Amino acid sequence: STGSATTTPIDSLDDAYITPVQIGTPAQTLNLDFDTGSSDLWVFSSETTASEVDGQTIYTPSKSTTAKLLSGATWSISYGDGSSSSGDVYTDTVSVGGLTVTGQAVESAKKVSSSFTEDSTIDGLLGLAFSTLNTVSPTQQKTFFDNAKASLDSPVFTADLGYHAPGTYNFGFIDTTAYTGSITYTAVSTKQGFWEWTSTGYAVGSGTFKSTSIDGIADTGTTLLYLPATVVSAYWAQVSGAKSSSSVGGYVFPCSATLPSFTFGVGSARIVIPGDYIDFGPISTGSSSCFGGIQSSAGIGINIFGDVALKAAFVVFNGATTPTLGFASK
Numbered sequence: 584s585t586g587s588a589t590t591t592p593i594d595s596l597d598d599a600y601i602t603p604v605q606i607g608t609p610a611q612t613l614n615l616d617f618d619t620g621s622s623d624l625w626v627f628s629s630e631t632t633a634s635e636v637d638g639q640t641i642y643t644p645s646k647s648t649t650a651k652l653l654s655g656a657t658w659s660i661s662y663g664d665g666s667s668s669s670g671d672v673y674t675d676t677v678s679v680g681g682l683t684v685t686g687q688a689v690e691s692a693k694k695v696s697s698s699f700t701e702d703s704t705i706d707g708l709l710g711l712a713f714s715t716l717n718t719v720s721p722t723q724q725k726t727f728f729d730n731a732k733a734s735l736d737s738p739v740f741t742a743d744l745g746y747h748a749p750g751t752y753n754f755g756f757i758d759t760t761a762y763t764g765s766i767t768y769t770a771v772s773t774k775q776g777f778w779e780w781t782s783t784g785y786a787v788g789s790g791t792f793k794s795t796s797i798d799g800i801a802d803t804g805t806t807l808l809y810l811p812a813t814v815v816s817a818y819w820a821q822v823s824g825a826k827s828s829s830s831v832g833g834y835v836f837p838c839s840a841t842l843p844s845f846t847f848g849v850g851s852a853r854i855v856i857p858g859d860y861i862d863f864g865p866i867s868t869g870s871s872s873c874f875g876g877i878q879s880s881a882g883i884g885i886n887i888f889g890d891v892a893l894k895a896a897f898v899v900f901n902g903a904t905t906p907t908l909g910f911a912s913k
């Protein structure tokens with residue numbers, strides 16, 4: 584089997600991408616944030632504290648003939664931005680882009696943090712990291728991808744994120760029309776439960792390539808690119824007036840600047856992030872100071888190849904017994 588679903592930016596800054604997902608019988612369609620950096624599928628629901636729901640579409644298991652309470656199971660998760668949610672668990676039929684999984688754990692939120700409440704466009708998350716990160720207790724649950732994996736033609740999914748434009752998540756096949764050149768595959772470590780890999784280095788603009796190993800994770804659920812302070816300082820040093828601002832919480836630059844590209848290495852291959860991708864616009868409406876798309880990972884503990892990097896590539900998440908990550912230009 585295979586699935587193919589369009590993913591769409593939630594706003595004009597590509598802060599996140601939402602993908603329609605069908606849950607239950609008859610289908611209830613929710614727009615979920617596909618997140619290769621976590622492993623829970625959770626949704627706003629009829630159980631979510633009313634004051635914490637503001638415009639989201641909710642899952643109502645009582646209206647689904649295939650929903651069953653997973654008795655005694657609870658879940659609680661916190662994300663890298665400090666957001667969080669928790670609740671209980673149903674099993675139900677879940678379909679993405681024509682690909683159907685029965686008995687999927689659908690985690691129903693009883694509580695969500697304000698950042699989720701304030702974002703009316705995201706109805707929940709669909710985790711695509713390894714199931715060892717799933718937070719359901721006392722019986723840990725499998726991701727949509729892990730459940731689907733047996734039925735898939737190939738144990739892969741691909742992320743093809745758009746720049747200010749819709750993109751595609753495919754399951755079970757690699758669309759050879761969706762990229763140019765060849766795909767370069769690189770080893771993945773699952774030891775921390777992430778799609779963790781090692782970049783072979785970087786270049787700033789037309790500068791020479793610096794060969795250096797950078798361990799990081801491929802994370803569709805993170806907006807920006809977070810790299811070691813040495814790397815990020817070398818990048819912003821090439822932008823007149825750029826600086827790190829503690830008040831703003833990262834690198835800012837004059838909106839009048841032209842940003843250089845940023846290249847990262849995948850084995851012997853090179854993925855080039857255009858300068859425009861790194862511009863996240865005025866820090867507040869009307870400001871002449873703009874927020875940078877490349878930021879330091881120093882306060883995080885881990886380097887993160889977020890949307891800023893991933894949208895510059897066609898990315899293959901290979902969930903074979905020996906998992907790998909593939910990157911191609913597009």
Ligand SMILES: O[C@@H]1CNCCOC1
Pocket residue numbers: 618619620621662663664802803804805
């Ligand atoms: O908000 C980000 C999304 N990715 C999962 C881990 O970090 C949290």
